[PDB]
Design a protein around this ligand. Structure first.
Ligand SMILES: [Br-]
Ligand SMILES: [Br-]
Lengths: 244, 244
């Protein structure tokens, strides 16, 4: 069959949740892509907290993060997300999307190494313009759903230009769901500082005999629907019989 | 601060399921152990498929298994477990407890290296007497629930005398269940070749801020009740408020 196939029926899952957006799927065995919107699949947005994936990789590879157990002490500044107001390691910082910990990583990485690593990763537009500690939230960096899939496929295969160890640790930190039928490794992101306000969910589904990569973004008028990126993606995964 | 405490109230979970056995828990932060039966906690049994944990480690460290993607082709001999009659990698061989794949690993490891590795691991009675490809089913090797916990704690901390990489890959292969509340890395086993017939479940529960190691075995006259090992462990984890 064709390399990319458009399936507009997935739009019903967006419409149900009063949104619009794109889901991109990649069948690794068959080397075939599926999307409800070919053009939005290639439209580039701020990555927001999906940037915690490359940020983690670079921080581990440079020794800014020694391992997934190293504690990053709360700076003692009360923020609006309760789970951020405590000590974190890489596992909990990824799980609760703890921006302050990743802002500290970014400052220690520095502009020069951050720029060189994103170039080596071929990551989105590779543009870190703005604050070294906020550019993925309100700076110049842009990435499309298809570019997220290209990056994730390299991570899955340990083909990024960082140690095998760095890639294994980040894939561990990405763990979201597992049962006897499937494993999901993924990262949410909510781009709310600059229009258009969007939610991301990017990662993959590990089956016994295949991997399905996914990258989705949706218009997100308010953070009321934080759970929606996952709920919409799962409706598409269920329709395509990837998960029960 | 007491090291080992007996909690016979867990026996209600065994009685409810018309069963007998032992659950051993270890609170990693507090360095405290809990069990419904101090004597049975320290009684040694054949490890059966719980042996796939050290077997995997040794196979990876010696290069018998290159990585978790390497395919082990079905030998084309029809066996009575449908999931065994197909190709496997380390992930699926662990998940479906595919004995024939691990018997082939054991043959390539050989007696001398298997013996040396189990001594280095301080694994159970370290006795491989019998056939190098079946000793964990009907040879000399024996391990207690408390000995399972001692071995698993070393694996968790990457303290076994094999590469960090080997230990990370086996911990990935052990992934059983994950959600927003906990991660379970574990391995089942069913010892049938010598009395008493027992089911095992050994591993750990990863929380945000703690790890609970567990090792349980139960009398298992038929494979009808294999699912009880997990159900009983979870009733104990719930009673102790480790998981919802
Ligand atoms: Br590694
Ligand atoms: Br994992």
């Amino acid at each position: 069959g064709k390399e990319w196939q458009e399936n507009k029926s997935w739009n019903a899952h967006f419409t149900e949740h009063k949104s619009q957006g794109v889901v991109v799927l990649w069948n690794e065995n068959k080397q075939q892509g599926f999307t409800n919107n070919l053009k939005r699949a290639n439209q580039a947005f701020l990555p927001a907290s999906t940037f915690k994936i490359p940020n983690s990789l670079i921080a581990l590879d440079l020794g800014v993060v020694k391992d997934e157990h190293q504690v990053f002490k709360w700076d003692g500044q009360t923020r609006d997300i309760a789970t951020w107001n405590r000590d974190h390691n890489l596992i909990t910082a990824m799980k609760y999307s703890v921006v302050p910990v990743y802002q500290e990583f970014a400052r220690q990485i520095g502009e020069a190494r951050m720029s060189k690593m994103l170039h080596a990763f071929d990551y989105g537009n590779e543009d870190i313009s703005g604050n070294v500690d906020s550019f993925w939230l309100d700076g110049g960096i842009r990435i499309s759903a298809t570019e997220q899939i290209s990056f994730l496929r390299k991570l899955y295969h340990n083909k990024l230009h960082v140690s095998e160890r760095s890639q294994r640790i980040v894939k561990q930190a990405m763990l979201t769901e597992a049962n006897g039928d499937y494993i999901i490794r993924a990262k949410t992101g909510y781009s709310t500082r600059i229009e258009p306000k969007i939610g991301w969910w990017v990662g993959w589904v590990e089956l016994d005999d295949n991997v399905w990569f996914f990258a989705m973004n949706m218009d997100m008028p308010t953070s009321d629907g934080l759970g929606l990126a996952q709920a919409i993606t799962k409706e598409v995964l269920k329709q395509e019989k990837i998960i029960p």
